[PDB]
């Protein structure tokens, strides 16, 4: 493997305007039962998920009283 300046270069940046646009365009789906998918347009999907919840999951009790306490 030769040395090169690619490899140590960023490849897939994205900006805040695109992030906000795509995130706002995931609560307007309106699925059609007669449209089928052909391609999916690879996107960073772990940044556009996470609709708001109301739960706030349980806290870890093991960090205060382990078991010998």
């Amino acid at each position: 493997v030769q040395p090169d300046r690619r490899w140590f270069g960023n490849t897939r940046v994205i900006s805040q305007d695109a992030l906000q646009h795509f995130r706002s365009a995931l609560g307007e789906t309106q699925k059609d039962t007669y449209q089928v998918l052909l391609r999916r347009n690879k996107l960073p999907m772990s940044l556009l998920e996470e609709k708001d919840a109301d739960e706030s999951p349980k806290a870890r009790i093991l960090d205060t009283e382990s078991y010998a306490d």
């Binding site: 007669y34 449209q35 089928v36 998918l37 052909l38 391609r39 999916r40 347009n41 996107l43």
Partner: protein, 88 residues
Amino acid sequence: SYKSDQGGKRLPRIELVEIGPRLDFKIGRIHTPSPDMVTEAHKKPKQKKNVELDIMGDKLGRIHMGKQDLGKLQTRKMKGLKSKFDQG
């Protein structure tokens, strides 16, 4: 442009001022384009049915089910649906 008060802060009332020049023009001789050159000078550089690109990317396609008339399809004449074998 000045404040209007008839159209809110969006649309103002505008005013013009004449700066220059100020010319008149009368027609002289002309030389008109030939048909071939006219058809060769209006060219768009060249840079899909049922296929659409959604927002988010998402190349999608329509499938267009037909019309389905079940007025055909004579249902099978099973023996229990024939009243001839009625046990009375």
